[PDB]
Amino acid sequence: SNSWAVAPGKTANGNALLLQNPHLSWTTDYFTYYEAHLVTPDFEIYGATQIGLPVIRFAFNQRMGITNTVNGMVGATNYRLTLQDGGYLYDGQVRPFERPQASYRLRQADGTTVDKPLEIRSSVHGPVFERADGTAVAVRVAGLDRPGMLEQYFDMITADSFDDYEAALARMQVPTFNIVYADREGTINYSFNGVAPKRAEGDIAFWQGLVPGDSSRYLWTETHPLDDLPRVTNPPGGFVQNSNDPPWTPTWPVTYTPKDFPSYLAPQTPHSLRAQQSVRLMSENDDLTLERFMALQLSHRAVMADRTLPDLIPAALIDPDPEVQAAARLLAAWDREFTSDSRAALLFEEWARLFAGQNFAGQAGFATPWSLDKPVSTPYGVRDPKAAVDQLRTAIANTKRKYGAIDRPFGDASRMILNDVNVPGAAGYGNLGSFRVFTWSDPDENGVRTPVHGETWVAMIEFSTPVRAYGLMSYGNSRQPGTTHYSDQIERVSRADFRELLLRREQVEAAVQERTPFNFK
Amino acid sequence: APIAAYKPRSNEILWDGYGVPHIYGVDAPSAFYGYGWAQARSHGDNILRLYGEARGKGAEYWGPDYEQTTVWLLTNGVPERAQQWYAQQSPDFRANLDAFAAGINAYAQQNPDDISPDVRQVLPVSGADVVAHAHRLMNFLYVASPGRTLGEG
């Protein structure tokens, strides 16, 4: 997911700009987004949210708006238990498990059900589970005493002022997520949100792995208040952003450093190339108009190529294999953009899969390692050119196996297909540097692949008076069997042809095609 | 000075050409009811299936493919905690949650042939079901996934 908020001083018209851009599976049911608009005499909200949720997570109205991105807040701890004498060893003593005898029904293939017993055990940490390898693990989840998550979101998205917004956010009922805010007043804000347990020792890596379940030394009981978490409001740089990267470069120049917070709140790992792009796209541009803002969102640069081809190409041209030389010249002529007509992009991805691993996040292959001191220009270079050329040799074979050639048009293999609509793809993997994301699946027998995850709900809002906003939903607004609103937006997505989002009654009445009157009590 | 706010005088959903619902309500509960109605029409099958799972009845309704999640949720006391969270809601907000569920039930009742046969057994849904799904999504999917605890990736 991506998120941008721009202050008035950085825009041409003096109105804050906001980008909602969550990235999630195109198939997982509970991750499906739905676009809607609610209006009553006392409030108005427009936006997307996961199906089943009664409140809009990605909302905006005439006054304010917010967006979210995953921060992976570590709000739970898995503890390795030491089983002994019918209980578990804790602080040198055997402690008893708390346990109720439950039961549930299991539907059989023939439609009937059978009753199955289920013993539920809990240690001081929390419910106990047993892994396949026999490890006994107790999971402790924070915020199980916070029943107001839905109302907090509701109060946040209908706040009459930034102060009211912060007051609601401060209730700490939303357990995770980075949240970005912007309003017509000109205020922008970034908050590393969630319910974080207060710990006396251990860094994030420690708390993410199996923690010793035999000592009260690791049993946390309190959580951090909002003021203890990384936050940024109206920074000197005039913008805030987050593309899932650790919260250390939310704006530029930065307003805090890792040393200002507990080491267990967030990782200090290398920022993805997409995240590096996010910071550059915002910091390097000024006098932004909504139009330009939207154009920048479509960025699909093969940043990884900029970091590696300078060293790879020369090294590859040394190889006597005519095929390797050809591949190098193909990669050399490439403008390093993930366009539909790119004939070098597929081959590059295949080389990158080997150079940086299947998820493209590997760091071992670079010559110069990532550094927080050069957050948007590292890592860089190829550490072992000779080994990298051998990887290219293998990549050439892999590209041919998957796509049938080393120079197949990116958009011929990469397609977005929903029902009977089949359109050319562009942009790609975020870890390769693409800001606009389409995590292409493995190809089929024809070498055709489609997005499994990526751009879903995409919207850009300018808080002028009245507000002006545009957006699109990759997989439509409905997934019910036979609906005509599942594949009806993907063609526009393939041309980056955004819909004007309609909030004003006059606009809605002009676009309405179906009316459902109703009543309730 | 923002533009003047619209004041609905009747409850209605105005759908645009892309199936986007513009829900107008005379009060809060009315808007939530229309929203539940709209969501059911657009994503009813999956919403009902998910609410069924949040009840800890996935295995009961659909079998083995849903059993692991059933064990995960029951062991973590999700269904019961949801009932508690529901009871702990402020009167006003609980009314909105009830309305939302009511909207889902109403759509299903008005268009029985449009609800997938396999999920009809889930109806009717309640405000507690709504709280349960949100609780599952936030705390037992996002924050604490079964994969991380079971070490199954």
Swiss-Prot record, chain B:
<protein>
    <recommendedName>
        <fullName>Glutaryl-7-aminocephalosporanic-acid acylase subunit alpha</fullName>
    </recommendedName>
</protein>
